[PDB]
Design a binder for this molecule. Structure first.
Ligand SMILES: [Pt+2]
Length: 593
């Protein structure tokens, strides 16, 4: 079996069905769907999951026959049709769905039958031309010809699809979103921890329904922007917003504010707030700097959702009010109350202060960052199209010459791996409610919140101190104990391939020493998602002197962000040698293209 589809899908079902709290989020007819799936032949299931994992559409039978899923497809198709899982071309009625089935040559023919301008144009141009032209009923003739070219086609029924899609959603809350069917899930070993729920995330079936819907909406818009369709991301935002202004006053949402942050992010209101945030990003690309502000004030006006997205909101409110423009009178109105917001991280506090400095009151405060050592290195920029490496790979070579034979470009991951190795027991400890809810988590659900540290404070305080005052020998021992206990395998916070060997991990740890590791581990436990991002590109070290350097690499016209300046300062404060390594694009005279 060179797909993993059914295998992973079956593991997903097992994981979700285990929790009887979750299964009450489906009615009997819906759980009936799940029973029916199990009753299907192995082959019917292999086909269903394959269709289920890909983006939804009709599939030609010829395409299913060609990719050789069974010897005779007819009985499989019938089993699936009888069970309510699949529908056939008799139900295929929407012109746009039919056109989508067609190949480039097929569309080209249709175009000649119907005398379109450019029968040799792009598939999507031709499709749009057909749709536009489709208004004895001409659109009907087009539909009939097009259906005829398409041939027998199938499509998974939207009803059972939604059951499985919600099951898939329950399986991994937010931690291209169903790629889980693509990896070998069944082969993965998860950490040993105890499931322990106390608090429901979803009130009832409806709550999960609404959350699933909001989730799909956000994902459509997120992808639209990434492809560059800025016009076509604006209208669903407004569709969302219309719905949001009704939803925010819904009774089902009153319980969501009694959830700790680490569960609250798995609720509708959180999803809409993320929509509204994406919405603001849209207007900024569309030069509509007026309406963005109106939405930023509304986001900032509330403290229920996305508190970690406050600094970015104030920072954009200011930048918009500044160079977008009127009036320069209420920008500092926003900068001052921004600087008063305790949810705003140091990086955004700087960008706000850095703008208040631009001047003609202005009472407080005092923002200043320690400078770190800068270095310039030389390299040969390759043509955008026309031996042989990337910017960091280059820098590594410079440090190799400079004396640091060992080096790793892992960014934050190298440290979050050490962290996972040194704090495994605490990260996975029992007695914290709501934090492990199923058997397939790689971390506790509160890793990235203030709640992680507070719920484990005594163990962390003892452990962080144990590390700080530890001799090198102990550190090597701890890394080994975890490594061996988790067989270099269990799926977690630890990137088992980040290091060449347990031996290399042990060397790094003997160079960093207790104090530095403890400081970084303390940071990772206090604010994981933000510490990790701010950790520099490389760690390099000399194997004999045990000296090491943390190094950020900046290519030509690459700039140290505010966030990075702060974290380099924090690392330096812990006693680590820290350096910015600039690369200057230089000429060569000995190898062209
Ligand atoms: Pt994309």
């Amino acid at each position: 079996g060179h797909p993993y589809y059914l295998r992973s899908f079956l593991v997903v079902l097992k994981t979700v069905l285990e929790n009887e709290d979750d299964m009450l989020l489906f009615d009997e007819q819906e759980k009936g769907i799940v029973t029916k799936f199990y009753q299907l032949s192995a082959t019917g299931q292999k086909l269903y999951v394959r269709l289920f994992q890909r983006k939804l559409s009709w599939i030609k039978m010829t395409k299913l026959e060609y990719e050789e899923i069974a010897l005779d497809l007819t009985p499989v198709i019938e089993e699936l049709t009888n069970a309510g899982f699949l529908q056939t071309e008799s139900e295929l009625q929407e012109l746009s769905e039919v056109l989508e089935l067609l190949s480039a040559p097929e569309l080209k023919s249709l175009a000649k039958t119907f005398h379109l301008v450019n029968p040799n144009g792009q598939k999507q141009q031709l499709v749009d031309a057909f749709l536009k032209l489709a208004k004895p009923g001409i659109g009907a003739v087009i539909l009939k010809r097009a259906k005829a070219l398409a041939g027998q086609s199938v499509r998974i029924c939207k009803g059972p699809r939604a059951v499985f899609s919600r099951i898939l959603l329950l399986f991994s809350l937010t931690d291209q979103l169903s790629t889980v069917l693509l990896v070998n899930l069944g082969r993965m070993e998860f950490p040993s921890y105890t499931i322990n729920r106390k608090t429901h995330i979803f009130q009832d079936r409806d709550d999960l329904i609404r959350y699933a819907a909001a989730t799909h909406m956000l994902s459509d818009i997120s992808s639209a922007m990434a492809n560059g369709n800025w016009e076509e991301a604006k209208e669903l935002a407004q569709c969302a917003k219309r719905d949001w202004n009704r939803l925010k006053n819904h009774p089902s949402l009153r319980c969501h504010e009694d959830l700790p942050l680490f569960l609250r992010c798995f609720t509708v209101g959180w999803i809409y707030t993320r929509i509204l945030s994406r919405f603001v990003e849209i207007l900024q690309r569309l030069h509509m700097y007026e309406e963005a502000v109106r939405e930023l004030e509304s986001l900032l006006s509330q403290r229920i959702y996305c508190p970690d997205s406050r600094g970015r909101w104030w920072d954009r409110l200011a930048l918009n009010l500044h160079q977008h423009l009127k009036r320069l009178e209420p920008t500092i109105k926003c900068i001052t109350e921004g600087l008063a917001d305790p949810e705003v991280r140091t990086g955004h506090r700087l960008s706000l202060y850095q703008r208040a400095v631009r001047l003609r009151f202005q009472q407080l405060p005092e923002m200043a960052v320690q400078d770190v050592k800068h270095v310039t290195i030389t390299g040969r920029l390759c043509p955008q199209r026309g031996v042989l490496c990337s910017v960091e790979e280059l820098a590594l070579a410079h440090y190799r010459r400079s004396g640091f034979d060992q080096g790793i470009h892992g960014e934050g991951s190298t440290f979050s791996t050490l962290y996972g190795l040194l704090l495994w027991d605490i990260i996975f400890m029992d007695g914290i409610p709501d934090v492990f809810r199923n058997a397939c988590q790689a971390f506790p659900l509160d890793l990235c919140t203030d709640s992680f540290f507070t719920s484990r404070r005594p163990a962390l305080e003892a452990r962080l101190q144990l590390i700080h005052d530890a001799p090198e020998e102990s550190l090597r021992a701890w890394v080994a104990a975890t490594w061996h206990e988790q067989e270099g395998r269990v799926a977690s916070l630890v990137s088992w391939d980040r290091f060449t060997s347990l031996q290399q991990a042990q060397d790094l740890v003997s160079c960093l020493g207790g104090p530095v590791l403890s400081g970084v581990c303390r940071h990772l436990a206090a604010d994981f998602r933000h510490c990790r991002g701010g950790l520099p590109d490389l760690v390099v070290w000399n194997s004999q002197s045990r000296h090491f350097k943390l190094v950020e690499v900046k290519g030509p016209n690459d700039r140290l962000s505010h966030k990075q300046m702060i974290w380099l300062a924090e690392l330096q404060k812990l006693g680590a040698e820290v350096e910015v390594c600039h690369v200057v694009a230089v000429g060569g005279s000995e190898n062209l293209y």
